[PDB]
Amino acid sequence: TEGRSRDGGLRLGEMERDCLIGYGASMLLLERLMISSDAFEVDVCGQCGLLGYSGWCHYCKSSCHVSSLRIPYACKLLFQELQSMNIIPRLKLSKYN
Amino acid sequence: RITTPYMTKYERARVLGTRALQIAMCAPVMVELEGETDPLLIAMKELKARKIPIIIRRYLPDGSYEDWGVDELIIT
Amino acid sequence: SGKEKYKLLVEGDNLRAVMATHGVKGTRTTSNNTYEVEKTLGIEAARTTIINEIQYTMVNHGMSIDRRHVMLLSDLMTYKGEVLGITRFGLAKMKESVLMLASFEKTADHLFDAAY
Amino acid sequence: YMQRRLVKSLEDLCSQYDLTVRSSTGDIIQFIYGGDGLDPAAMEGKDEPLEFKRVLDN
Amino acid sequence: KYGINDNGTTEPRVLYQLDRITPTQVEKFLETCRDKYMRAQMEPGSAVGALCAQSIGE
Amino acid sequence: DDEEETYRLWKIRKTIMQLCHDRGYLVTQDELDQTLEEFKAQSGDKPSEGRPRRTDLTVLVAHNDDPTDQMFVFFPEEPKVGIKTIKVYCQRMQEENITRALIVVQQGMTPSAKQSLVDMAPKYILEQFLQQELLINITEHELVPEHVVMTKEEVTELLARYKLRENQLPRIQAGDPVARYFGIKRGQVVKIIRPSETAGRYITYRLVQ
RNA sequence: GCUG
DNA sequence: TCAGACTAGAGCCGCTG
DNA sequence: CAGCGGCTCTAGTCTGTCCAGC
Numbered sequence: 192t193e194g195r196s197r198d199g200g201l202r203l204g205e206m207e208r209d210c211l212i213g214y215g216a217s218m219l220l221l222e223r224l225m226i227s228s229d230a231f232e233v234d235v236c237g238q239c240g241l242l243g244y245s246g247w248c249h250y251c252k253s254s255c256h257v258s259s260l261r262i263p264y265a266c267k268l269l270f271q272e273l274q275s276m277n278i279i280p281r282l283k284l285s286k287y288n
Numbered sequence: 289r290i291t292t293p294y295m296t297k298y299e300r301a302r303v304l305g306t307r308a309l310q311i312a313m314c315a316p317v318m319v320e321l322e323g324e325t326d327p328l329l330i331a332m333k334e335l336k337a338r339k340i341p342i343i344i345r346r347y348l349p350d351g352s353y354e355d356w357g358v359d360e361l362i363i364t
Numbered sequence: 365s366g367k368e369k370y371k372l373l374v375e376g377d378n379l380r381a382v383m384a385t386h387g388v389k390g391t392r393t394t395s396n397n398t399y400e401v402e403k404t405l406g407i408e409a410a411r412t413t414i415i416n417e418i419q420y421t422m423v424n425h426g427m428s429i430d431r432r433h434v435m436l437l438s439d440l441m442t443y444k445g446e447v448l449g450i451t452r453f454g455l456a457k458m459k460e461s462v463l464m465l466a467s468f469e470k471t472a473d474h475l476f477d478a479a480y
Numbered sequence: 481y482m483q484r485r486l487v488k489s490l491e492d493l494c495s496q497y498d499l500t501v502r503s504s505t506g507d508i509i510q511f512i513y514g515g516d517g518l519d520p521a522a523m524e525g526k527d528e529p530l531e532f533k534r535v536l537d538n
Numbered sequence: 539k540y541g542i543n544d545n546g547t548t549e550p551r552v553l554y555q556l557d558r559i560t561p562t563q564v565e566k567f568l569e570t571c572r573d574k575y576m577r578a579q580m581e582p583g584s585a586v587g588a589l590c591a592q593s594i595g596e
Numbered sequence: 597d598d599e600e601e602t603y604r605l606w607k608i609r610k611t612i613m614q615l616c617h618d619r620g621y622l623v624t625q626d627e628l629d630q631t632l633e634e635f636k637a638q639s640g641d642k643p644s645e646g647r648p649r650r651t652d653l654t655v656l657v658a659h660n661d662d663p664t665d666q667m668f669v670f671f672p673e674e675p676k677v678g679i680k681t682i683k684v685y686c687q688r689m690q691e692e693n694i695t696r697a698l699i700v701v702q703q704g705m706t707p708s709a710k711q712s713l714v715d716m717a718p719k720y721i722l723e724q725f726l727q728q729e730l731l732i733n734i735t736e737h738e739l740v741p742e743h744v745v746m747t748k749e750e751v752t753e754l755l756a757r758y759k760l761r762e763n764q765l766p767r768i769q770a771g772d773p774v775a776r777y778f779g780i781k782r783g784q785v786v787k788i789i790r791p792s793e794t795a796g797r798y799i800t801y802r803l804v805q
Numbered sequence: 806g807c808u809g
Numbered sequence: 810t811c812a813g814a815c816t817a818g819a820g821c822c823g824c825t826g
Numbered sequence: 827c828a829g830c831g832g833c834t835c836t837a838g839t840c841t842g843t844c845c846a847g848c
């Protein structure tokens with residue numbers, strides 16, 4: 192939330208982001224701007240590249256290609272605002288190796 | 289062996305960070321720590337004695353790679 | 365005290381013509397404008413003019429920057445053969461990533477183009 | 481506004497293990513960083529790595 | 539200027555203080571210079587565009 | 597005038613000699629180094645010194661590779677060049693079996709003539725130069741470094757030393773004036789020798805694209 | 806609207 | 810509020826046939 | 827004598843304008 196009245200918390204702006212890049216601090220930038228804000232998991236079907244739910248893909252009517260991806264929630268939100276605009280972000284996922 | 293002998297600042301930060309997380313998760317400590325209750329302090333002591341069980345794999349832009357042991361790299 | 369010689373300062377925007385009038389030493393005339401220098405002398409002279417002009421402006425206000433920073437900025441603006449700005453238009457010619465482009469300016473248009 | 485623009489454009493550049501500066505796509509911006517390979521934060525002199533008169537006296 | 543002889547024989551020994559230099563000092567000088575050069579190189583991984591961006595912006 | 601007009605026909609010819617010497621065509625040092633008074637001896641006033649046929653140069657020959665390889669430098673009298681002037685130039689080139697020519701136009705070239713130079717033939721390549729560009733040898737300008745056109749056996753070492761592909765090198769346009777001067781084409785690499793602030797040098801490379 |  | 814560097818149009822004249 | 831075509835020119839329009847707090 193936004194501030195002191197609402198026990199809101201503090202903002203890591205676009206300028207503080209530019210500072211941390213210049214230190215090469217890749218994991219701290221991941222901790223601050225993902226883990227301690229909006230960490231989430233989505234089911235992604237590797238066949239159609241769309242998001243699914245509960246390990247089920249309604250588009251394919253199958254259960255075998257679905258996988259879990261660690262994603263910021265604001266990006267999941269973006270990936271559902273864009274589909275309603277009919278801009279489809281079809282993902283492709285490799286293994287983490 | 290073309291890559292710099294000296295360990296980079298970025299390499300030291302990650303090696304200490306992974307080692308501290310490993311020590312904080314009950315890994316064996318090779319430094320006989322004396323009165324240390326903080327994983328990051330224990331990890332830094334290990335680096336000074338050059339006894340950290342981690343190998344740094346340096347990937348060249350083309351895709352070729354060279355592996356340097358933490359002990360082999362000079363620490364400044 | 366050692367010498368007295370007259371240089372000619374031209375407030376205008378045709379470098380090629382001033383390089384070609386009888387009695388101007390064309391090998392040693394310069395311009396502020398990177399677009400004129402690019403059109404007349406090519407990308408590598410334009411690259412040096414970005415270095416010279418940023419460093420001139422910094423020194424006048426008493427700032428100092430190591431030359432390696434203004435060097436990298438100029439190499440970034442000229443590596444594709446044309447002097448590309450740090451504007452949204454230059455960044456769209458340098459950067460391939462949709463989400464990088466959509467996270468700066470024109471956030472709607474880049475996302476519909478990637479869909480098309 | 482200027483700072484936002486410059487950073488968005490230059491954020492990607494990284495100095496590589498083969499002593500080159502490359503974009504994220506793998507194109508070359510510079511074959512060696514700054515011509516010398518040297519770090520601005522380490523300059524004991526005016527843009528130069530050492531000052532020999534001072535070092536010999538030390 | 540002072541008529542010093544390189545064999546070290548000249549009687550007012552204080553003359554050898556004027557521009558003194560010893561082999562040990564030459565050895566330590568060359569090692570200090572060579573070390574300071576190697577440690578002044580821009581280390582691989584450095585986010586060198588973000589330093590460039592902020593150094594012109596500030 | 598007449599003093600000023602001959603001055604151009606000397607400086608342009610001198611620059612054309614310098615361009616031919618840089619491009620590897622064989623020009624004698626007497627042609628390369630001339631004086632306006634020596635030029636006056638061959639021709640003096642604007643009437644006697646005629647731009648259209650008097651100064652035309654087919655002397656240049658690529659001694660390094662082909663004695664037959666030859667270049668015609670043509671200065672058209674008309675300020676804007678039509679295809680008709682280009683067609684007369686092409687017929688002269690077709691008979692001699694020469695494949696390269698330079699056309700030195702005085703003010704410009706008409707659009708339909710410019711289109712012809714793209715498509716007349718890949719085996720008959722002609723380069724437009726404005727004379728206002730040739731009054732100053734840009735390879736001797738203080739802001740322009742030394743450019744050196746690299747051999748294929750050296751490009752294959754550049755790409756091996758860094759483990760690059762060609763399309764990761766920096767680019768230079770063929771429209772670039774230094775690219776026109778050396779007459780380089782797409783897929784050639786130029787070495788560029790930038791001067792340092794110190795006595796040293798920095799070497800960089802660009803790809804024509 | 807003001808503080809930063 | 811203040812550009813600002815894109816995107817079509819309206820031509821224009823003159824060779825281009 | 828007529829028709830492309832690029833130039834050239836209006837001008838039209840959409841696009842920005844620091845970080846944050848209360």
Ligand SMILES: [Zn+2]
Pocket residue numbers: 236237238239240241248250251256
């Ligand atoms: Zn599916």
